[PDB]
Structure 1
Amino acid sequence: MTEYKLVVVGAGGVGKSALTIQLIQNHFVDEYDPTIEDSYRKQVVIDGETCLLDILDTAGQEEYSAMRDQYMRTGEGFLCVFAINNTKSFEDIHHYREQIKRVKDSEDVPMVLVGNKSDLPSRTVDTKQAQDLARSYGIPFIETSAKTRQGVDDAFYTLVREIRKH
């Protein structure tokens, strides 16, 4: 019955839709439509306290649109996703974290850094570099695989814990 507005951010192709779908529907969709943006609602129990999740899975190319800024205003927590095999996607995290801190006007915005596709063999972003970035932000870092399910509940639930702590 308390509702959390969550926003899933990160470059195209990192797995934002595969994570969100895995969480909601419990399976891995290979090659989900790259171009669709929507919210998904789910009722979950975390640490024994029921809540409603309202999760925006962002899509589209954007030089910073007004509609995106409106959704960032509404967001209560941000899941910032990169892919461990994609150096550019990791480089983009800086930029998301700047926008988030600007829109919310705050250094202390509930956020979790998510390194997705942890099942993949050719890792290009070092775990230690992500851990260090996360630690410098003071936010949790969780490696996930939307394909394996590894980490998926933990990423979203930890973001909820971050809202609740805050």
Structure 2
Amino acid sequence: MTEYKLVVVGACGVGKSALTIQLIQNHFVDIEDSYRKQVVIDGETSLLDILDTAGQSAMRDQYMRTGEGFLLVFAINNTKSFEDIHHYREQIKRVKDSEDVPMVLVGNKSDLPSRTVDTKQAQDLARSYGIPFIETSAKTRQGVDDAFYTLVREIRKHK
């Protein structure tokens, strides 16, 4: 059976944990740093081993090296978190020592009316990196499966 090591990166408070909890435990409440569950994606059974991190040591650099795919998460009501995305992508590329690393850009908190990051901005950035962009809400579950499953699919095309 296939195991996919995924890493969810992004600034503090963007909803990395909420997204992962929603995926794995199917709920949202307004504490675990890692998660593990077997799911079926496009008919293939996959064990997802997922780490949520903001980069703020030995475990971290380790999980980056072996992480096979990365969700780059920002919140649509957090301009700084969007600006931080470049730093996260560059850091990953450095540690992987590679230019073809599976990634997906995730704009979370899409249910909220406060928006300071335009969808156009995010789409343009994703196009530049050559990766998918998915709008999500850990609260409503919008895009949650799609974000993670799309990443798994990026990992497959990569191999």
| Superposition deviation, residue 38 in structure 1 | 2.3
Q: Is the 8 A contact 1:21 1:29 kept in 2?
A: no
Q: Is the 8 A contact 2:17 2:33 kept in 1?
A: no
| Superposition deviation, residue 122 in structure 1 | 1.4
1:34-84 deviation line (CA, Å, top 9, x unaligned): xxx6221111111111110000011563xxx34321110010000110000
| Superposition deviation, residue 14 in structure 1 | 0.1
Aligned equivalents of 1:153, 1:16: Cα separation in 2:
14
Aligned equivalents of 1:60, 1:130: Cα separation in 2:
22
Matched, 1:127 2:119: yes
The corresponding residue for 2:65 is 73
Q: Is the 8 A contact 1:112 1:159 kept in 2?
A: yes
1:61-113 deviation line (CA, Å, top 9, x unaligned): 3xxx3432111001000011000000000000000000011111111100000
Q: How many residues align?
A: 157
Specify the SS of the correspondent of 1:80. Answer: strand
Specify the SS of the correspondent of 1:125. Answer: coil
**Once structures 1 and 2 are overlaid, which stretch shifts more, 66-75 or 48-57?**
66-75
The structure 1 segments of at least 4 consecutive aligned residues displaced by more than 6 Å after TM superposition are none
Q: Is the 8 A contact 2:123 2:133 kept in 1?
A: yes
Which residue of 105, 110, 113 maps to 1:113? 105
Aligned equivalents of 2:41, 2:146: Cα separation in 1:
10
Specify the SS of the correspondent of 2:107. Answer: strand
Q: Is the 8 A contact 1:21 1:28 kept in 2?
A: yes
Q: CA RMSD in A?
A: 1.1
The TM-score, its normalising length taken from structure 2, stands at 0.95
Alignment of 1:31-110 (within 5 A): 38-59=33-54, 61=56, 65-110=57-102
Aligned equivalents of 1:2, 1:141: Cα separation in 2:
25
Aligned equivalents of 1:125, 1:150: Cα separation in 2:
18
The corresponding residue for 1:3 is 3
Residues 129 and 152 of structure 1: CA distance in aligned 2, closer, same or farther (over 3 Å): same
**Unaligned residue ranges in structure 2 (runs of 5+):** none
The TM-score, its normalising length taken from structure 1, stands at 0.91
**Unaligned residue ranges in structure 1 (runs of 5+):** 31-36
Report % sequence identity.
98
Aligned equivalents of 1:60, 1:139: Cα separation in 2:
21
Specify the SS of the correspondent of 2:59. Answer: helix
